Amino acid sequence: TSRDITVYPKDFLTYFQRNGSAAGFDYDLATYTQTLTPNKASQAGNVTLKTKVDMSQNFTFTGKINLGDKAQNAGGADGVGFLFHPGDTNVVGAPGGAAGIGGVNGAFGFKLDTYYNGVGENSFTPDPSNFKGKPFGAFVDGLNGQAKTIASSAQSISEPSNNNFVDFTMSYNGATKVMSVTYGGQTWTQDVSSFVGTNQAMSFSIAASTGAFMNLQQLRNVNFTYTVAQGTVIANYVDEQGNTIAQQETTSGDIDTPYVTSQKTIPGYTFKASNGAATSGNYAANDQTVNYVYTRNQGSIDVTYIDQTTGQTLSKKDLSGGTGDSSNYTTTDTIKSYTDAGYELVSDNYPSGGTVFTDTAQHYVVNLKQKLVVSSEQKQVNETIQYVYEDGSKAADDYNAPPLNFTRSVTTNQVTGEKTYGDWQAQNGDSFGEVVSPTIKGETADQLKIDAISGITANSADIQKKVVYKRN
Ligand SMILES: OC[C@H]1O[C@H](O)[C@@H](O)[C@@H](O)[C@@H]1O
Ligand SMILES: [Ca+2]
């Protein structure tokens, strides 16, 4: 590959980051020596690799390790750990029994344990009982966070003595997935495929730890030949409330080589903003993540009610929801309310099957008019002539003249109450007849005829007359 590099002893600080206690000590370029811990108590120091490692390529790690001058019995602690995890380059494991492996997830590697921890806690499972107070080198399974020492790898090592540097070698076949560690004519082997999984890019941390007991722990003449793993960009396509609304796009590439991400076009949604990384940039050692946030496309429906009679808006129900939600709305009730008030439905554009919000607006109309009830008014003007004697006794039957009837339409607006009368129309005529007063033998009428009367209007008063007969 083009990312196949060999870390030289003089460029150590280029590819490795002194962290913790280690940051107090400069790299001595005469010896090529990096202190991890000094010979003081409760110290922690490490170097982290600035990149990650393609675990689908071969790597060869060479150097010398000073484990100190004291052994456990003389007050010597805690050892040096080599950490392999998939998380952040700048993460390191817990000190003590965790040996700088435990406390990280998906964590494996090699310890040189210069202190026996029989009492276990969360960071680490007790050290193998067969190595009570004895220096040993092992492989560690820190996948579940808790560093477990594999007793099948548990081998003794030489006690830290007069601050001496023993040769260390860690070799790795990309294709076998087998790790080979040599420390002063003790060798280790293990298939690490059960750990690398699929990640094929792990962070590397060499980490020393003192506690109550101490030791100078130091590194010298570090030769790392490995393939720089390539950076990942994750792009998530999520709604406003975090729920994912389109498949994610995990695109990988060589560090410091460009990356691009696509603003997906999502049915039912419109792009709002891109929280997180740039949508465009350069690949980097750690995972970068750009989140595309989308808004839920919202539909309009407005159902206007109109009083035709006035050409005035009665009521207007604005509805808004999500492109494809039902509205669950029916006119029927709002219609009723107007109909009961004396209105009359004309038309209803509102679909019978509720409705559904769409990316385009809907506008429906309910046409209502003030009802009008047509009645009839009738009025009658009569004429009566009473034929009587001087004592009031009837001389002759009362004449009721042919009645003069009159009709008018009455339109009552069932909303305003406003009664629009039509006109008075004469059914019978406008004029009452002449009535010649009957002749009675041996009597004389005070009026021998009642004259015909013209100009009868529907408001006219009923005519009442009285003819008195006198004897002779
Ligand atoms: O250093 C010896 C010992 O001292 C303390 O008890 C802690 O800091 C331990 O984890 C450590 O291993
Ligand atoms: Ca231990």
Residue numbers in the entry: 40 to 511
What's the publication's text?
To obtain crystals of substrate-bound YwfG, ligand-free crystals were soaked in a solution containing d-mannose or α-1,2-mannobiose. The structures of the d-mannose–and α-1,2-mannobiose–YwfG28–511 complexes were determined at 3.00 Å and 2.95 Å, respectively. In each complex, a single substrate molecule was bound to the recognition site, which was located in the groove-like region between loop 7–8 and loop 13–14 on the YwfG28–270 surface and partially overlapped with the calcium-binding site. In the Man–YwfG28–511 complex, the recognition of d-mannose by the Lec domain was the result of a hydrogen bond network involving six amino acid residues. The d-mannose-OH6 group was recognized by the main-chain N of Gly250 and Phe252 and the main-chain O of Phe252 in loop 13–14. The main-chain amide of Ala251 also formed a hydrogen bond with d-mannose-O5. The d-mannose-OH4 group interacted with the sidechain of Asn156 (Nδ2) coordinating with the calcium ion and sidechain of Asp117 (Oδ1) in the β6 strand. Furthermore, the d-mannose-OH3 group interacted indirectly with the main-chain N of Gly136 in loop 6–7 via a water molecule. In addition, the aromatic sidechain of Tyr154 formed a CH-π stacking interaction with the hydrophobic face of d-mannose. The only combination of variant and monosaccharide that showed an interaction was YwfG28–270 with d-mannose; that is, the Lec domain alone could bind to d-mannose.
